[PDB]
Amino acid sequence: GMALKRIHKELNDLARDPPAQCSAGPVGDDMFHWQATIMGPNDSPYQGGVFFLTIHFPTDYPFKPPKVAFTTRIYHPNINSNGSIELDILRSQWSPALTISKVLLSICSLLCDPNPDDPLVPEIARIYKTDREKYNRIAREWTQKYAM
Template identity: 30%
Template structure:
């Protein structure tokens, strides 16, 4: 019995001598996100930012559209990825209040690929850039980048913006411009997002 006790003490002393930062266990979600981030093809209009470089499951994506109605704006999205990724899609939220049919006033994003059309075979690139090789996914191919090129009035979160887009495209464009500058549209004040 004494021998077992002394062996336990020896092991404890050896472990204490090798004191140092213990390596955290890498999860399957972290491995997949790391792979997806390495394969991410961001154009010149998009950048990722990591508040904590050790936390790759939470990051920001900035989009600076260089064409379309939202040209000249800078939009920031929070990406939160849970430990069940890729079985669960990333949670994406716009950090600014903007006038957009597919983004509500709280920043929730309505994008099929982030909801019912998400599949574990899809990756972050599909969510961010959009054009996934699988052509059988129709509207799900529209990713974050295309959210600003072609807003979708048929699947809105902001119903007023969608009605404007459907009923009066030129009026919608004017409202977008006013909102980008931090103006008020339909009694609602928006964040200034012009660069």
């Protein structure tokens, strides 16, 4: 019904109007379980990295958000060691006008410009706020270590 119809539509829109540096789609035949990839944004400390994600759509999609997590380690104030993502639209600010394409754009922007006042990893938030050249150095080191 409504969830599968929206997931098929959002997959066709992704495929017809591809992003430049993200991909997402069903793992196999299960339309509710997707994988995504995001290339580290150019001019970010993640540049050259490839980051994998898992996406689980709920049965009442599009009226509740997908559950999205990283499976690649990343140094970021809003992503923890389990890959959990602190992002407003995946919790309190979800709307059925959002789509998986818009979620991927939002995650890309979050990698480009973190929310350190809503952290999952307090020390990374503190270094982001107090010493940005050090933050960028470490995030580049972790990109080389885990995402290449």
